[PDB]
């Protein structure tokens, strides 16, 4: 029951900078034979995982010399000694000699930029959808940074939990930002039962929640 912990979950970087991801265990993962089977894999968007380092410090063939692994026993470290655009991906440490055998939650290497408040927009259900007995209120929150953001929905003041489905984009290939969509779907009846629908966004770019609202009428 060797519980693994890889950090950080997310890692903001400016190209050219150094990165360091760590993998640590509650117990030592050294094998009876003396060896330590700690590996580091790189999985890019839509690609198969690639091996970077094996047995804690052995760089696999083809892997650039800017990638370094270290540690022993319980704490290990991957260290990109000069991050490049081509390294942006998700990094996983792995050991399969001890139960539980597994990949770490991963460390996603994203590009660092200046913070930016989200542009929020709310949209009432279309007459079309309602003719079919359903009502989806949509809220867009595009172009913010960091990715960390919390959306809350309110109907006639009370907060609402059930019926929400969110989806986020991946860091934009051009401006290093993220966007999100929050959709509240209710029955035409519920929608015609209430009048005030609010989409409230919380982001570090402000202490004041960004609120978008509309009244059914």
């Amino acid at each position: 029951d060797v519980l693994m912990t890889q950090t950080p979950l997310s890692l903001p970087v400016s190209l050219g900078d150094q990165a360091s991801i760590s993998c640590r265990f509650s117990q030592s993962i050294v094998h009876s034979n003396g060896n330590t089977y700690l590996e580091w894999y790189l999985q890019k968007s839509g690609q198969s995982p690639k091996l970077l380092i094996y047995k804690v410090s052995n760089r696999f063939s083809g892997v650039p010399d800017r990638f370094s692994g270290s540690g022993s026993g319980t704490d290990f470290t991957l260290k990109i000694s000069r991050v490049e655009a081509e390294d942006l991906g998700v990094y996983y440490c792995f050991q399969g000699s001890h139960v539980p055998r597994t990949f770490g939650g991963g460390t996603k290497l994203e590009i660092k930029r200046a913070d930016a408040a989200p542009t929020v927009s709310i949209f009432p259900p279309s007459s079309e959808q309602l003719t079919s007995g359903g009502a989806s209120v949509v809220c867009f929150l595009n172009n913010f940074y960091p990715k960390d953001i919390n959306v809350k929905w309110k109907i006639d003041g009370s907060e609402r939990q059930n019926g929400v489905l969110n989806s986020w984009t991946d860091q934009d290939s051009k401006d290093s930002t993220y966007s999100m969509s929050s959709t509240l779907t209710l029955t035409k009846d519920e929608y015609e039962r209430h009048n005030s629908y609010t989409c409230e966004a919380t982001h570090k770019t402000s202490t004041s929640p960004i609120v978008k609202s509309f009244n059914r009428n």
Binding site: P49, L51, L165, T183
Partner: protein, 218 residues
């Protein structure tokens, strides 16, 4: 010379019994362990289990998840690793990768095989225009949107003004809501072009031959 190629992905029924194959070449299949890992949509790559080499006797190992439901096997004489998956479920939708482990860890991975586990049949998408109101949203800019819901299977192609409106567009990753997918797309245009001009979102769902063009209208 070293090659591992999965196959067998496709659509499956919840409670079904699909079986994947990973054929290899260019190396002595007997001397290797073989790993099976899966990456669910949006979720993180996960390890399912492995089977040991000849020396260690072809003993398999599985995660606590696939335990009781999946089983690794290999054709030592032909060089084909197999992943028989039973009692399938929605959570089993991912891309499956096989890899060989040896003196250099998992140095060769396959290219993957996609599986989707649904009780849904082909379903055409409902397309609704998302128009603003008392405020457009942004400094002299307006954000319109298009909701594409209730379809199956992926994907759908959403376009703005037949491909004209390329800048200022965000198509968000589909989400599942009771077997079907829902997707939404947004676009930001200056307040000058809308509503004076026309903004239309084009949604194509090949699997059902649909192609809907929705005029965004105030």
């Amino acid at each position: 010379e070293v090659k591992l190629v999965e196959s067998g992905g496709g659509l499956g029924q919840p409670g079904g019994s699909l079986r994947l194959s990973c054929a290899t070449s260019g190396f002595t299949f007997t001397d290797y362990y073989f790993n099976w890992a899966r990456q669910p949509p949006g979720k993180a790559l996960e390890w399912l289990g492995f089977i040991r080499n000849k020396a260690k006797g072809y003993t398999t190992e599985y995660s606590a998840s696939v335990k009781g439901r999946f089983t690794i096997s290999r054709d030592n004489s032909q060089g084909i690793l197999y992943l028989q998956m039973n009692t399938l479920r929605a959570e089993d939708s991912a891309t499956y990768y096989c890899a060989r482990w040896g003196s250099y860890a998992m140095d060769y991975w396959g290219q993957g095989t996609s599986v989707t586990v649904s009780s849904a049949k082909t379903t055409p998408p409902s397309v609704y225009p998302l128009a603003p109101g008392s405020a457009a949203q942004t400094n002299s800019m307006v954000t319109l949107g298009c909701l594409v819901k209730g379809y199956f299977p992926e994907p759908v192609t959403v376009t703005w003004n037949s491909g004209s409106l390329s800048s200022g567009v965000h198509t968000f990753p589909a989400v599942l809501q009771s077997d079907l997918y829902t997707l939404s797309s947004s676009v930001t245009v200056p307040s000058s072009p809308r509503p004076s001009e026309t903004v239309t979102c084009n949604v194509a769902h090949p699997a059902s031959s649909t192609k809907v063009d929705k005029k965004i209208v105030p």
